[model samples]
Target: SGFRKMAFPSGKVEGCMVQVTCGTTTLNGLWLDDTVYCPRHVICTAEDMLNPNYEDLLIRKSNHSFLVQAGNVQLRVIGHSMQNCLLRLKVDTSNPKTPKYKFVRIQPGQTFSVLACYNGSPSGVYQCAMRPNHTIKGSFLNGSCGSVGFNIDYDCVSFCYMHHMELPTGVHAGTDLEGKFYGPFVDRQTAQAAGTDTTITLNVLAWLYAAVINGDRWFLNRFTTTLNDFNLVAMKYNYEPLTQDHVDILGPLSAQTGIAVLDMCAALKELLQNGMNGRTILGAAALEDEFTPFDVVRQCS
Candidate 1:
């Protein structure tokens, strides 16, 4: 295996896939989903990619999502010390006129301006659009301020999609899954990117799992299932603090679908009835399948 290393001024041993930064938060290595980064320190080219780290990603994603949903994240406008500045996200035909676009007007003295994450329509007005071909124009007003910087601290936030995504297991997790629109919809680039196998698919699944487990309706509407539904495969599971090992066994069903596994016997009956209806329920999609929506399905009633 090929490996290289550079000593940093700091004594800390950094992990593989870590990004080194000069001043700002350094972006990590190529991973499709934009959120988490690798947190382990190991030989750079060990080829241990087979089991990419999922625990930290889950914990961090969950923690960050909670903060974002709780309105704890803030967008800050850093203006020049000698002048006033204005930063804006302008929609062509803006909605919510008063704050149709996101604007931060800051004076020299008020160098750091802040916007609460939970303070607008469907969460923060400044949260980036979730779909493709984003038309919002973000610019610093000419007379307002120059050389201004904008900073948002949370990585868990969603932005306009640059691509579409398929499940890592080789099937499309399209814009609408079975007629329900749960979208971080994509543009041409995003759609094409989804077709290729990329390490970032793990990040996407991690985020999706977090969204489902966190009960974040903004990203997923209402798909849900329960413990009894899982037991049809003799699977034992629980929500709240799900681990990657658990995910490896059976990917979770998003709670937005309004399905519950009320009882074990009832689940068996429902599973059998669905089977008799010439419909399939609770069956694995392929050999050695290991993710939800493929490895598992909610018991039909």
Candidate 2:
């Protein structure tokens, strides 16, 4: 994300000097993790991925976990081109040569701060209608809306899917379930500017439902549920669920189509599961909850 937006037009983060870790993974494309703008867009992109097949972050975008034990620590570096740029990050101590590290630069203070970012995917974050710390100057957080989590705040704070969430009622299906971790104020203003509750939260559930029913995982990894989530929920060979209304809406679509109602909820057994745990078979054509062939077909058509 070098030259990210207008702020860092060059995507070049100006900072101090050449440095390295004893863990030695060596920070590469480092970004400030604006946490501000990143969360909203990433969630938006992640939801897109869930609906389809395919797209980390910069809070610590050199991205990774370094484990040290038994005197030998392994080095792992997670860096991507144009992550984001920040001022400078330095500590006093001056030295530690652990596993290994190498440093090189054009000059002593002339260093490049790279920003690591995944444009359309949610990375390590949670979702909920959170109340931000309006009182705390210069910060994007104030803790969760309830019990230290954003459960109490309503209206799906995020314009993007900020976290992996599933609403109780399966309505308003987009990434709205997740709140924006970085910019609650910006999102709130947008909703408030809407001038009516009907146009904001109250009326959006219908859209959310439409999105889920018409969803596809574009291929990102952060979403809790994918088409695959329901693929395994029924624990059947291949196929997913259908709301009674959805079934009626589909109106015996499988009657002439190749799709079959495998389980058909005969006895209402508690076979609902997630992911491919006991599944010896993979349901590539499996339909998720209320998946009418028209669901996927509608997108292309």
Candidate 3:
């Protein structure tokens, strides 16, 4: 709610009209008219009023005073400075003569404020009262009045990704092309001649690092391939490919979850290839049928 400049008809004369404007389009079905006047030398009453829009205003009464109900409307008081003055607000529709109202005591020249939440009661009116010292002799008007409203909404997205190469240092690659394997080799003479455990754990770590780099490339390639596939399919179907709008809707979620899965696959593939590289370094055939490295020991316990 906001206040418009105060309008004083004829520079503060008795019986002069005091009108407060609001940003809202209309008030209680009645468009405010020019003729409405605050009473001369006493609190304003319904009998002293003219041209009020009834549908837009809520009328109520409390303890024999007239009041006007401005629901959710901010009522402001301005301009006048009265010593120990009191002001009364009221809504007067039923029993307009004896209206019910509330008392708000104001110090000399002090500003007062209030939110119009409800009318007095059943068959009630809106009204306010001033202190005893305040004189209701002439029309004393203060403050501006206005109303406000608001609206809101919410949204979200979710998904998953799979099928990628795993790498060392917990990273993934997006490539398909294989790389040359490298690692330390087992000493065959020491193993067979003396029947000693001469198996050396190869520097498979290097291969792991390479796998990370390669896995990343592989994943990126796959990602590009997937996008191309999507585009081709869209073209074949005579439909538009994914647009900025589509990506905007799903990109964040896909990036978050898909990247994670991609990394995991890359890491796993790196470890598996690490073992194979280790075996190859040991002068053993790179057998596709082999599941685990033979030179390596596994304790049952």
Estimate TM-scores for all models: 0.17, 0.19, 0.14
Which residue segments of model 2 deviate by more than 4 Å? Answer: 1-186, 189-243, 257-263, 267-270, 273-277, 280-293, 296-301
What lDDT tens digits, residue by residue, belong to model 3 across residues 1-301? 1111111111111111122222221211110121111211123224322433322232332223222232344333222211111122322222212212221222211111111111211111111111112211111112211110000011110000100112222221110001111112110111211111111112121222222322322212232324444445434433334344434433333343354322332332343434343333223233111111110111100
Q: Model 2, range 93-210, lDDT digits (tens) per residue? A: 2223221212221111111111111211111222222211111111122111101111111222112122222122221111121222222223211221111111111111111222
Instruction: Please list the C-alpha lDDT of all candidates, in the order they appear.
Output: 0.22, 0.22, 0.21
User: Candidate 1 at 210: error in angstroms?
Assistant: 24
Q: How many residue pairs clash in each candidate?
A: 16, 36, 64
Candidate 1 has a TM-score of: 0.17
Structural RMSD, model 3: 35.3
